[PDB]
Amino acid sequence: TLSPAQVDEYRKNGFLVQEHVFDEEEIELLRAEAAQEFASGGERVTVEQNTGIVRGVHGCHLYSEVFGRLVRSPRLLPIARQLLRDDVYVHQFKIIAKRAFKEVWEWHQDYTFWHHEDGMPAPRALSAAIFLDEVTEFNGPLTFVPGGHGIGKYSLDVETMRGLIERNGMVAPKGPRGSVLWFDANIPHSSVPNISPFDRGLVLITYNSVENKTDVTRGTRPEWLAARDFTPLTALQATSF
Amino acid sequence: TLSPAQVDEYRKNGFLVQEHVFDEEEIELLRAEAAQEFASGGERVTVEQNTGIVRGVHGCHLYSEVFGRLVRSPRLLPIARQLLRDDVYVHQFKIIAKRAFWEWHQDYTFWHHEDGMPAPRALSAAIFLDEVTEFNGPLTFVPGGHGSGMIDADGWANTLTASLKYSLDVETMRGLIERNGMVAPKGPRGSVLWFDANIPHSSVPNISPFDRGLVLITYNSVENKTDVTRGTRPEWLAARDFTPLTALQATSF
Ligand SMILES: O=C(O)CCC(=O)C(=O)O
Ligand SMILES: O=C(O)CCC(=O)C(=O)O
Ligand code: PRO
Ligand code: PRO
Ligand SMILES: [Fe+3]
Ligand SMILES: [Fe+3]
Numbered sequence A: 001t002l003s004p005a006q007v008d009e010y011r012k013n014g015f016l017v018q019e020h021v022f023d024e025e026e027i028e029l030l031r032a033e034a035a036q037e038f039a040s041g042g043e044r045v046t047v048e049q050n051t052g053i054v055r056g057v058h059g060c061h062l063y064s065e066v067f068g069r070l071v072r073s074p075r076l077l078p079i080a081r082q083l084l085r086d087d088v089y090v091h092q093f094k095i096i097a098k099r100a101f102k103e104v105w106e107w108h109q110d111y112t113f114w115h116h117e118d119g120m121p122a123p124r125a126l127s128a129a130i131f132l133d134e135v136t137e138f139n140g141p142l143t144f145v146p147g148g149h150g151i152g153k154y155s156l157d158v159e160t161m162r163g164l165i166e167r168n169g170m171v172a173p174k175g176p177r178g179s180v181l182w183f184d185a186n187i188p189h190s191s192v193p194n195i196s197p198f199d200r201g202l203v204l205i206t207y208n209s210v211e212n213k214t215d216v217t218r219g220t221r222p223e224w225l226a227a228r229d230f231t232p233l234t235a236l237q238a239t240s241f
Numbered sequence B: 001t002l003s004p005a006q007v008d009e010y011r012k013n014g015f016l017v018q019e020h021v022f023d024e025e026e027i028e029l030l031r032a033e034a035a036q037e038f039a040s041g042g043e044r045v046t047v048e049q050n051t052g053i054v055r056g057v058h059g060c061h062l063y064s065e066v067f068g069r070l071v072r073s074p075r076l077l078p079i080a081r082q083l084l085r086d087d088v089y090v091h092q093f094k095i096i097a098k099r100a101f102w103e104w105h106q107d108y109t110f111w112h113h114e115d116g117m118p119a120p121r122a123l124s125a126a127i128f129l130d131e132v133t134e135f136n137g138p139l140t141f142v143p144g145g146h147g148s149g150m151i152d153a154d155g156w157a158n159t160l161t162a163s164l165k166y167s168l169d170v171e172t173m174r175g176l177i178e179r180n181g182m183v184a185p186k187g188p189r190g191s192v193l194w195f196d197a198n199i200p201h202s203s204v205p206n207i208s209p210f211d212r213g214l215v216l217i218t219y220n221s222v223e224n225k226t227d228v229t230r231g232t233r234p235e236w237l238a239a240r241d242f243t244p245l246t247a248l249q250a251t252s253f
Helices: A004-013 A024-040 A065-070 A077-083 A110-117 A158-168 B004-013 B024-040 B065-070 B077-084 B107-115 B156-160 B170-180
Strands: A015-018 A045-047 A054-058 A088-098 A125-131 A142-144 A180-184 A189-191 A200-209 B015-018 B045-047 B054-058 B088-098 B122-128 B139-141 B192-196 B201-203 B212-221
Touching (some): A004 A077, B077 B122
Antiparallel strands (some): A015 A180, A045 A054, A088 A200, B015 B192, B045 B054, B122 B192
């Protein structure tokens, strides 16, 4: 679990980075497994329009043994329970390929899209972005308005951003391969394009509160984008095998 | 004049920043004159291909007295001469609007094919009308990538596409960057970024909600004058008058 000093950097800033949570052997396992999901997700892999290039794949924690364990990991599941003062469930899971010379980019709040088109009641959620590769200034890093979480499609306009940014600034947190970037479901952020010539990968996991579940009433999206099964997640039945 | 350390740095990396060359009042005059040039520039204002968004205005030094003086500034002209080892003239002038919310290229490549520049004995001076940060689309360079070795010598729709023109492929850049890195020089308002005609570079979009301005002056060596028989563009993009630039006399007016 996070120190109280880490919990309060997260409460203050709206995001937090822990470095080298995962080692190179575990990351490489995640990279190989992401390649299998790319090669055999069907409708679950997103492709570009006028190009044949793969940008992402979703839902893998429900079709892959490895990713099912990943989301129940002691380096993830506890921190998400702690931070959300609850038991939690995965709202969505994806693997993003930030391709060299990049996609859709506008400043947003995640909560907004979930609230309307899936049915989240409150911003009682977060995301853990696992860095499969080093995040630098030049490979399109997630970029935040720190403190920002406190709202002729769901993108924040320049007039509101103008004000939000004059007060708070902007940060593009960096980090080595194997870092985790935890960020609030109501922090405003944007993806810069990758002007480096090197592809970059991410695993993005959204933990939602159980008390805070979806209302199936409103939902439009298939299970691999928005989750139907709200069973609390627990650590793997504990074993010497 | 640049110190000997600054010249060597320019020659090694292909670029150099000088901070606070122009004071605040100076920048405001340039800003206000730039806004005039955008409102009156007519066919000299350039617009994005699909969207009609205003990107720049060209050749303003031939039409505005402030800008005609600017290219002769004792803050610029002597450095241009120093670095090029010659009399110089203005090959092109633009004002760029990097709007709130691209391709790796070498400037010289375009100038050689379209304007008849016989060699990369030219440079540009980028005057920061606003702070350059990591978030407002700084010009980004491969240090040392302008060296004569660095890249081995050489489609219709591509050439008609502004953002694609004479752009380096990802395979060329992959090699360049592994070995050399990328660097995005930052600076305060009023800084000047000098960069080589042959240095590979790119500009990320501006994701800040603030517009950002830049005055870009390309100086060329007189001995490296453009071959006018190979020129295809109007004077306000590629100059054909090669009068050596001379210092402003210091006077009471
Ligand atoms: O795929 C991307 O580039 C951005 C992912 C993201 O920002 C999100 O959904 O939270
Ligand atoms: O800042 C820009 O829009 C690109 C400028 C540039 O690449 C140049 O003219 O040398
Ligand atoms: O699909 C999702 O859940 C994310 C939320 C913001 C936009 N797309
Ligand atoms: O128009 C020009 O002269 C510059 C040269 C490279 C791209 N645009
Ligand atoms: Fe997002
Ligand atoms: Fe250029």
